[model samples]
Target: YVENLLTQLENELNEDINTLLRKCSLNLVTVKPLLATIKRFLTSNYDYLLDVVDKLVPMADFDDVLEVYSAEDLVKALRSEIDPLKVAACRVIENSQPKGLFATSNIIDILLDILFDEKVENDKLITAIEKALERLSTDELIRRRLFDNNLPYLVSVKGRMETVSFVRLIDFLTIEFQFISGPEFKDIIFCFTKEEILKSVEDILVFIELVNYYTKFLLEIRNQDKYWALRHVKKILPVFAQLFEDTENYPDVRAFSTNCLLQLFAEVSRIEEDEYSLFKTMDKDSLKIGSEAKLITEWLELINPQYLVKYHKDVVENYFHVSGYSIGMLRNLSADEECFNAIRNKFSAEIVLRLPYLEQMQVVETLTRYEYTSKFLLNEMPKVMGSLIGDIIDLETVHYRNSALRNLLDKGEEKLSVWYEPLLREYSKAVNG
Candidate 1:
């Protein structure tokens, strides 16, 4: 009988709340008493009342409530020993009118404290705090405050935070503060294990962009640690390869992954050039058959001549920068003899012919690297030399064009003789006269 009575009473209260909301909506009743009732429910810490308050607060007016409670008073409510009361206070702040009122308050600091507190294991409370922060962070001042005061702590505790919370933090950091300083940012990046990053691949692209932006702008004098992406290449490379091969991903995303892969290849090539190279003692043929080689082979299969030729115009028209990177990726990959063979077999002369003038020069330069590819281009695809020579002569005043043509000529002469002789005479006539 007692349980039935309690259930009946709860139903009656829910009905009354709807009636009250209807009356307030029509301006037929004042919320002055309603606000007092909410305050009573919050202070009473009664579970049933708090549940009703949670249902009622989101739809009700809280402007007058803020005026009466003040932002400081509400923050005090957040510190209540009761978790429901703290959640209720967060709801009030989240639904409060003129949301910017809490921008200057100590609410963010307290919220971060609650969020990072080891003892606060209540998922609802943590979620409420995250939602409240998301709502309030729309204000520029609050975002700046979070960046200046709370970023390091937030990033430091990333292991414990939810994925949504961490992703949102990165979005905020990258949105306003384009250049983040200090090693803590790197810590933010490396904190995620490869598995962690793979689980959140779509969201983790922001992390990739953060690393790319930092490396591009900040690390002029590269250090061991500054090559963060390369150092973590074993972990990051697979992610890039997966993204690059997945056609379901956005064009810019695929292109950006390809760009990063090219960068990793460049870094590896740089290290290989040193006398004490990382792979110095390993057999060159062994390097060709390694896992890295296998992954590159997969990339080449996906990024075949057909895809490049088909999307050449689409990519150049929309994502112009990625076009250069994609072609540069092919050029870089060809430095390895096995990859050079892959490129030579998979690509036709049409791939070079379809590229823009500059990209044609880049591909021709790579093709001339090996005797087999050089012979294929010179003997089988004779039109490539004619097109390359015409384009180079047409754009002779361009600084890189002449140098690229000269390098191609040198590589051709080294790889084969008779085929390049005609182009050498053509180049002599074109430039001398």
Candidate 2:
């Protein structure tokens, strides 16, 4: 009965035949032939077929209906200049399961093409495509396929899309794949200008998280291609430094930015002596040498030790967990003599003594590198010596504290001479094993 009804509608259109076709009951058995009939009408009478699709598509099993058309046929329909046809194509894909046509289609490519097409600015069309993608992405195989096939193109067109859409696309890519690499990844990151990032708070947070993930990913692969990895890090160094130094931003943003910068510095410093020598030998008078020197100077100027100390105090008072990264940043920065002198000038003994034990040790270790800072620590050691020793009973803690105190005494003796006797006497008891 249903087959006869569909056959009658295919031959000619009449109110009586249309009414009979609309009245026909659909099931898994009848839906395929009905869709095949509709496929024929698509070229002969598309406007009438669209109405039939709107009415019958909902009742038909999507699996049965989708099999009636080839993937290329579906893509062609979506590519049609007609707005309703494009939307109808998206609806078909959106409603289908992961098997059959969808599993084997170039849908990802067409969808990305539609997304990147500047003239296809119809909100409903774009939203339909996004919805279809969202549905397809739920299938694990499709998600992997989506990332593998589209990541480079996606990265290339990133600036062309709005932040919300780009962020959504990133979320989709990163859902199961935490590691991304290649020159495309580098280009994506290099485009993250400060102005682009600071456009919104959500944008700032997501970009920071993405950057942190990328830096950690690079560090994991650093050994395999050390110079290649560090070169990428060096390219983005200034932006991360600027983000970290901007106190006007959210603490979480600043803290993560500090984390990336600190990891980068530690990674650079840990380049083995042989590797360092190789780099120096190969890059004599290279721009890397001058740029690195400039980077260190810029870092020293931006990281105000006085501001960090005060920020730490605020964190302790208010219970912010982000306090430690800035101190670690300072510790790394102090390896340079100019930065060490700046820290010594801006940081005081009283403030250093008041910091948490771990932070106090970090500052003391950094300060002990310079003569004036060493004398500064020795001057304040008398007041906190008993508490410091009493609090640190672990052997490893004792060992490091002992090493720092001995260094402080050594530097104090060299710089303070006769004035260092009292400090030496006091630290000698503390340092005694």
Candidate 3:
């Protein structure tokens, strides 16, 4: 009777036919009988087919029968110039998503073509296409097929500076790690560096999206597979750290990168063994694990506010020994005068030894402007003063030496205030004498 009603609508099926299909709970067995009439009705009344699909998709018992019945015609519906049909086709595809399901490569490729198409400015079209890709990604076999087939095209187009629309591509790629194989993941990390993506895409915001995506990927994989952590941490993290330091131009990049680094450090903090056993177990690079751990520790300590308050006693412990990076961090944090002097007596001499040459000179130049340090130097450390001046003079480059001289001598310079100069003049008297 249902077939009788559907076939009779043959040329005439409209909403009345829609009512029958919906009420009948059509499956492959029943839909098989009326496929031709249903296909014809779909081609004519796409809007009405969409109305019926809107009803059918959510019904849990709606099974693979629909795909069996209309999968071929629905592929054509996806390629339709009519927008509503394309959307309806996507919903139908989404409706068919099941564990271990396989969407044909034909549909996957066409969806990619539309998504990467430059003229595709319609959000609805782009969104429908994203859903199609996401649905296909759920099946491991199909996901691998999509990555093998589509990732190369994505990378090539983005890397070569082709004008591709990226309304949904970045978001889709965010979860690509969940689907691609291990070697595939490694290949992708190598294929595009941060510099390449920025140059090609030319949008920091988009680049941030990419970095955050990979950051999330690393955070997830590092715990599940320690091998992945040891292999990629140095490769990926330094680049992320550089991005985090660039706060003004790339705050979003910095923010997510900070989160990435914090997680990394937090993870490292959880490892207790002196020789981290996870990396040691890998036969290929067992010896390198100790060195890598040291490097990672150094890198972790290199971040800003974290470096300051994190290791307190290690920074300003002894008067004659102090870390330049630590001093700067503490000073930036506004550690009190007593806090500065407690580790002060030969702080400048330690500064000379600990900092790089240029940075050492800058610290000294600033120290000359401080009352407590200038007063202490004039009173107790006159010999260290000669060494400071001698080190600056021995530098082959005139830029820093001349700048240091001006910083020391010019009362008009903000660094060398008029009120402070006569005070440091005693240090000058002690040194020259």
Candidate 4:
């Protein structure tokens, strides 16, 4: 009996809301009283409103038009329902962000008020709630409103959702980092990387996971909110193209193909026409770009610790061995029609793969393919050796043209200690001519 009356009242109220909204155009004359009635109903007989919402619309987008007026009252009333009505109520309100309907409302109060109960034990549900909160927080405009209210308060409320909150913490940091000093920012990051922070192995996945989470939220709820997350990623496209161009200076994380390529195509449907053209221009110079391109972060240029050791190992000791091993590995890579097709699918289509003899491994195994491998690997050996010496030589040693030139005088083909002479002349000619 009560249910029927409640349904009739809801129908009549919706009709009345429509009538008043249409008549006054913008004046919410109907809302002033209607909102009071909603508050009364939600406060006096809260179970009745839940019964109706629970029956009619039970999921994420279940928008019962009647619930909008009782925003604060409904949030409070539904806080303790057996069914997750608060989540549903929150969703309905979140859907309002795009229309600028609840943009001014204290929706954060409605969100945070319920957290006051301190049910920190339900870690899973807390994690789930943080995911929704993350969706709300990623919007820069919306998040600014949050900060305007109280950034510290929001960060405090985040404690309830600890396990899954780190991703948002990063987002929050990025949002707030503009105001933080460099040393403070460094200290904050240092603390977060502590073993106690995540209760898991600290790895690069920390960054990747946060990025993936942020991207997914934008893609999924993009329709509900006007801000397409990919749109911002698109705004940075020009920057991405040039980031790695200065690769000769330093190694940048952006050059990781997995990372940069995704940023390139954020809302970008066609890479061939737009990005590829940009890439071609940049690659003619070294194919690099970065967010750290500015001079402020320039001093933060991480010097390679033990640079010469790696240079010697990479260019000298380990270089020839790895080069030979690479040849051996490539040789063992099959040339079968099936294998050849698969290789093209992955690396390059036009280039055919073949076996090469490596001399080091075949030094003992005379009857083996190792001798051929050594010769093949050495094909690129001189170039790698030159790179190592060029880096350190420019730093520690001085040279006259004939100094290294004299060494290579007799046998230009020998793996001679006199390697520097011709190389220095080449540099002299390059500079003088």
Please write out the lDDT profile of model 1 over residues 46-101, one tens digit for every residue.
44455545555665567666654677777778788877778778877777566666
Off by over 4 Å in 3: 1-42, 45-55, 58-71, 97-104, 160-164, 181-186, 189-191, 197-201, 222-230, 244-433
Backbone atom clashes (below 3 Å) for every candidate:
0, 0, 0, 20
- Model 2 lDDT tens row, 249-312: 5555554455555544444334444444422322232212223433443333233333223222
Pairs in steric clash, model 1: none
Residue-by-residue lDDT tens digits, candidate 3, 101-181 = 434446676777777777877777677777666665757766755666666776755554443455355566655555655
Model 3 pairs in collision:
none
Point to the candidate with the largest TM-score: 3
Off by over 4 Å in 4: 1-69, 81-83, 97-100, 110-131, 134-141, 155-433
Query: Number of clashes in model 3?
Result: 0
Whichever of 1 and 4 has more lDDT, that candidate is 1
Models 1 onward score TM values of 0.38, 0.37, 0.48, 0.31
